[PDB]
């Protein structure tokens, strides 16, 4: 089957410069009626892929001609004039040229933005929670930007590594930042035998730790 | 308008089959070829199969062949494809599409897709979610706003609805996707107000678990 190479993997653009994808085929997508069936699609977050063009430069109805694509044989490219917010996604060249049609591995776009320190927040167990013999302590890292964070878990001074789940949300069309939950769990035992819970994170906008806790008692 | 309506997510087991429907509405069915694609981890699209509603005519990808079986319904205008003996590699998200492609105008028309049905091959089994309540102590925020939140967790198999106030409140809310432990998943989400809205006026979680029939509201309180 022919195989599809494209490249970056991944670009960071600031609105309103040019970005540029490459897609190189293993066969050349000539046909031989002399046409080249190279499409290119974009796949936004949470939606179904679209089709942008097609027969290599040709746009399809309703895109921006912001976009354009080039290129002939096993080259080709695609770019955008003036990157917006709405190109956020993932971008894949397809070839219908030869059977069985194949697809690119994608490169994703995202939007190049200043710098944002995280908004942190802690929750200790819910009673709801406590009564069924669990105990998760709660961790919001929201809007910040560049996504690349560390975060750790100690309790009375000393990292945990187990019990943790974490997870990320893709870049934030509304204002390009990124968000992250991380979750500890233990028994509800274990949670009322020590005090202080701290959710601390390694980030770019801080030259030490960013850190948030509270400290469990009782009256 | 041309619209492409699939069908609900899928969990079955290994060995097993299903049959995924795409239903159409819009445009004449009998007149385009339908195609089937496949979306696995994220980033892996393949291309399965393509039928021509008007004569039954199929083709397939090797790959697939055994594999998938499409069949097309004029009088419903649904197009159909039953996935065989599922195992491991099956567990993706399947997409029916009108592409568009006219041979012989050698030109396109605008290629319409359906919203994507996930299918999960597991044996593992039907767990209803435990949702928590997340007020405030430090997650405060302080004054000016504060953030709550609601934990899901401990269900199977994905996926799981959560909505704050109804849908009504759905700007600074933040849902995670969820991820899989010991065979059961774990989701939050956030919401930030501002400290003129919460405790004064009530936020409430909503979750729907569809695979064990669990709908449950829970109330933020301090
Ligand atoms: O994704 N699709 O449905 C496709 C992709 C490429 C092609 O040539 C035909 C159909
Ligand atoms: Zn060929
Ligand atoms: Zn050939
Ligand atoms: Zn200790
Ligand atoms: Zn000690
Ligand atoms: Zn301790
Ligand atoms: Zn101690
Ligand atoms: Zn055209």
């Known amino acids: 089957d022919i195989v599809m190479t494209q490249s970056p993997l991944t670009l960071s653009v600031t609105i309103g410069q040019p970005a540029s994808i490459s897609c190189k085929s293993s066969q050349s997508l000539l046909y031989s009626n002399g046409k080249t069936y190279l499409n290119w699609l974009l796949q936004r977050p949470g939606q179904s892929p679209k089709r942008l063009i097609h027969?290599?430069?040709k746009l399809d109805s309703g895109v921006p001609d912001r976009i354009t694509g080039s290129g002939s044989g096993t080259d080709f490219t695609l770019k955008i004039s003036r990157v917006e917010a709405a190109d956020l996604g993932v971008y894949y060249c397809?070839?219908?040229?030869?059977?069985?049609?194949?697809f690119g591995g994608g490169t994703k776009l995202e939007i190049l933005r200043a710098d944002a320190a995280p908004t942190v927040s802690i929750f200790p167990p819910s009673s709801e929670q406590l009564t069924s013999g669990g105990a998760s302590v709660v961790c919001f890292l929201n809007n910040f930007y560049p996504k690349d964070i560390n975060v750790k878990w100690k309790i009375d001074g000393s990292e945990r590594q187990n019990g943790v789940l974490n997870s990320w949300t893709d870049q934030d069309s509304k204002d390009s930042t990124y968000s992250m939950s991380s979750t500890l769990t233990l028994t509800k035992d274990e949670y009322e035998r020590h005090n202080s819970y701290t959710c601390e994170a390694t980030h770019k906008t801080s030259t030490s730790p960013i850190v948030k806790s509270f400290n469990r008692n009782e009256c | 308008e041309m619209q492409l309506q699939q069908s609900g997510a899928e969990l079955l087991r290994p060995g097993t089959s299903v049959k995924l429907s795409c239903k159409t509405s819009?445009?004449?069915?009998?007149?385009?070829?339908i195609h089937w694609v496949k979306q696995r981890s994220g980033q892996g699209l393949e291309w399965i199969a393509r039928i021509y509603p008007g004569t039954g005519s199929t083709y397939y990808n090797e790959k697939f062949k055994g594999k998938a079986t499409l069949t097309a319904d004029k009088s419903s205008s649904t197009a159909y494809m039953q996935l065989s003996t599922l195992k491991s590699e099956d567990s993706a998200v399947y997409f029916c599409?009108?592409?568009?492609?006219?041979?012989?105008?050698?030109?396109?028309?605008?290629?319409?897709w359906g919203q994507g049905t996930l299918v999960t091959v597991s044996s593992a089994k039907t767990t209803a979610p435990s949702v928590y309540p997340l007020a405030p102590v430090c997650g405060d925020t302080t004054g000016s706003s504060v953030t709550l939140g609601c934990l899901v967790k401990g269900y199977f198999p994905e996926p799981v609805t959560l909505t704050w106030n109804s849908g009504s409140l759905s700007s600074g809310v933040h849902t995670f996707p969820a991820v899989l432990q010991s065979d059961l998943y774990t989701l939050s989400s956030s919401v930030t107000v501002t400290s003129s809205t919460w405790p004064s006026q009530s936020i409430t979680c909503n979750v729907a678990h569809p695979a064990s029939s669990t709908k449950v509201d829970k109330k933020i309180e301090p």
């Open positions: 599409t009108r592409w568009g492609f006219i041979p012989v105008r050698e030109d396109y028309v605008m290629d319409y």
């Open positions: 819009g445009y004449i069915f009998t007149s385009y070829w």
């Open positions: 397809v070839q219908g040229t030869h059977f069985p049609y194949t």
């Open positions: 027969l290599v430069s």
